[PDB]
Ligand binder design. Structure first.
Ligand SMILES: O=C(O)c1ccc(/N=C/c2c(-c3c(Cl)cccc3C(F)(F)F)noc2-c2cc[nH]c2)cc1
Ligand SMILES: CC(C)CCC[C@@H](C)[C@H]1CC[C@H]2[C@@H]3CC=C4C[C@@H](O)CC[C@]4(C)[C@H]3CC[C@]12C
Length: 241
């Protein structure tokens, strides 16, 4: 079988082994919705407690994306500088895409600490506009009904982007990007799903939402810093130190 068919299978496998939550569990858990009393309990928590809970959930989600990246064929053969450039620019963009699997467009809820709740759950953070933008982005993606394999291949391409400023081996990243682009396009053709290509987000949209999100995380980290065991210490030290 072709190099390309093996690449499709290796990306989909890496995604399945690092997807964090199973699509089947997320879909079954949709009727499990926070009560009005439970929502008020979250809204009454301090900004610093809600920050600690959200920062830790986001850090864990990032570490699943680092492991995904480390299993992509060719990623570990890039020099360490380029691994960090791609993960710094891309890992949180991948988390914001992965969110659509945990999002219910019928009631605008996300899976958070065991149940589905609306953006009002997060009232204590004082970030309603940013959180509203994140919910709207997931709402956009949800209308594609991405397959597990589509989201594996799309998120691989979010990370493997030869236009990220600061790459030292831009040609080696182009070669991996071209192969992943061919794998995605090959797979959409094979499954009669080329129709999603015209519906994917404007590329600057993900970058611009993500830059606002990370800027806000960096401000909270500065006021009330959390600490975690780095999966990728060189990357951690770039973001945290
Ligand atoms: O090695 C590891 O395990 C590891 C774990 C997490 C890392 N960064 C996470 C963050 C955060 C963030 C979060 Cl999630 C919570 C609190 C504070 C921050 C802060 F802003 F301070 F960085 N924000 O953006 C990213 C990011 C990562 C890649 N691109 C953007 C980096 C390495
Ligand atoms: C701006 C900062 C301070 C607050 C952000 C609040 C909201 C939007 C955050 C807090 C915790 C986050 C979740 C943490 C973990 C996961 C699992 C991952 O597989 C998909 C994304 C998902 C489901 C995140 C979606 C966004 C999320 C719900």
């Amino acid at each position: 079988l072709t190099e390309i068919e093996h690449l499709v299978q290796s990306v989909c496998k890496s995604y399945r082994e690092t997807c964090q939550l199973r699509l089947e569990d997320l879909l079954r858990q949709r009727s499990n919705i926070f009560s009005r009393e439970e929502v008020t309990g979250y809204q009454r928590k301090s900004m610093w407690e809600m920050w600690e809970r959200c920062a830790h959930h986001l850090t864990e989600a990032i570490q699943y994306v680092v492991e995904f990246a480390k299993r992509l064929s060719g990623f570990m053969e890039l020099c360490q500088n380029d691994q960090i450039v791609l993960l710094k620019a891309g890992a949180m963009e991948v988390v914001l895409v992965r969110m659509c699997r945990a999002y219910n467009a019928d009631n605008r809820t996300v899976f958070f600490e065991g149940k589905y709740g609306g953006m009002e759950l997060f009232r204590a953070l004082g970030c309603s506009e940013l959180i509203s933008s994140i919910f709207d982005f997931s709402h956009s993606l949800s209308a594609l009904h991405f397959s597990e394999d589509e989201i594996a291949l799309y998120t691989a391409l979010v990370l493997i982007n030869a236009h990220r400023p600061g790459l030292q081996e831009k040609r080696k990243v182009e070669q991996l990007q071209y192969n992943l682009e061919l794998a995605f396009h090959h797979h959409l053709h094979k499954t009669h799903r080329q129709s999603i290509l015209a519906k994917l987000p404007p590329k600057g949209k993900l970058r611009s939402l993500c830059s606002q999100h990370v800027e806000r995380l960096q401000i909270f980290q500065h006021l009330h810093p959390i600490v975690v065991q780095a999966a990728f210490p060189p990357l951690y030290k770039e973001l945290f130190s």
